[PDB]
Design a protein around this ligand. Structure first.
Ligand SMILES: O=C(CCNc1ccccc1)Nc1scc(-c2ccccc2)c1C(=O)NCc1ccccc1
Length: 330
């Protein structure tokens, strides 16, 4: 089997991407944030505290004839950025772009934090990291990809995120027309439950490539590119007027200043992020100071190849016996 779904930016800044997902019988379609940095499929629901729902589409398990409650089961997640959610657990039929999994754990939110409430465009998350991170208790539940894997033509999914444009998540096949040149595959460590890999280095603009190992994760659920302070300082030093602002919580730059590209290494291959992918616009409405898309990982404790990086590439999440990651230019 295979599946193919369009993923769309939630706003003009590409802050996140949503993908339609069918849950239950008859189908209830919710727009979920596919997140390769976590492993829970959770949704706004009829059980969500009413004051914490503001415009989201909700899943109503009582109206699904295929929904089954896991009696006593709970889930609770705290994301790296402080946000959180928790609730109980059902199994139900879940389909993405034509690909169907029966018995998928659908985690119904009783509570969500303020950032989730304030974002009306995201109805939940669909985790695509390794299932060892899944928070369901007493029995850990598998991700949608893990459940579908055996049935897929090939045990893989791909992320093709657009810049200010729609893109595609494919399951079970590699669309050879979606990228240029070849796909370079690189080793993955699953020790932390992430699609964790080691980049071979970086360049800023037309500068010389610096060979250096950067361990980080391929994370579609994180907007920005978070790298070591030394690397980030080298990037913003090439931007006139750029400063790290303690009040804003990272690097900002004069909105009209030219942004150089940022190149990262995948083995001997190179992925080039165009300068404008790094522009996240005025820090507040009407300001001529703009937020930067490359930031230090020093406070986070882990380097993150988020949407800013991934959307410059066609990315293969290869779930073979020994998982690997593939990157191609496009
Ligand atoms: O990048 C984000 C959230 C992006 N989503 C978004 C939605 C609406 C408006 C704007 C943005 N948050 C960050 S920054 C850095 C991390 C992080 C990840 C792993 C480990 C340490 C830090 C996360 C994060 O927690 N991402 C998961 C997430 C969070 C909230 C919503 C969706 C996904």
């Amino acid at each position: 089997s295979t599946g193919s779904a369009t993923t769309t930016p939630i706003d003009s800044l590409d802050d996140a991407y949503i993908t339609p997902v069918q849950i239950g019988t008859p189908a209830q379609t919710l727009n979920l944030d596919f997140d390769t940095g976590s492993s829970d499929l959770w949704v706004f629901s009829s059980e969500t505290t009413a004051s914490e729902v503001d415009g989201q589409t909700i899943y109503t398990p009582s109206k699904s004839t295929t929904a089954k409650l896991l009696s006593g089961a709970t889930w609770s997640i705290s994301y790296g950025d402080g946000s959180s959610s928790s609730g109980d657990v059902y199994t139900d039929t879940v389909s993405v772009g034509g690909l169907t999994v029966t018995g998928q754990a659908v985690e119904s939110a009783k509570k969500v934090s303020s950032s989730f409430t304030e974002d009306s465009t995201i109805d939940g998350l669909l985790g695509l990291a390794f299932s060892t991170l899944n928070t369901v208790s007493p029995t850990q539940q598998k991700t949608f990809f893990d459940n579908a894997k055996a049935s897929l033509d090939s045990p893989v999914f791909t992320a093709d995120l657009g810049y200010h444009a729609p893109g595609t998540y494919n399951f079970g096949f590699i669309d050879t027309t979606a990228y240029t040149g070849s796909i370079t595959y690189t080793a993955v460590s699953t020790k932390q439950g992430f699609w964790e890999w080691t980049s071979t280095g970086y360049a800023v603009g037309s500068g010389t490539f610096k060979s250096t190992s950067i361990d980080g994760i391929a994370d579609t659920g994180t907007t920005l590119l978070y790298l070591p302070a030394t690397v980030v300082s080298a990037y913003w030093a090439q931007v006139s007027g750029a400063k790290s602002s303690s009040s804003v919580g990272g690097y900002v730059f004069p909105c009209s200043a030219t942004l150089p590209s940022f190149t990262f290494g995948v083995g001997s291959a190179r992925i080039v992020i165009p300068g404008d992918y790094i522009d996240f616009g005025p820090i507040s409405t009407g300001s001529s100071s703009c937020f930067g898309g490359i930031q230090s990982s020093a406070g986070i404790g882990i380097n993150i190849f988020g949407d800013v990086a991934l959307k410059a590439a066609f990315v293969v999440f290869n779930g073979a016996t020994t998982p690997t990651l593939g990157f191609a230019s496009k």
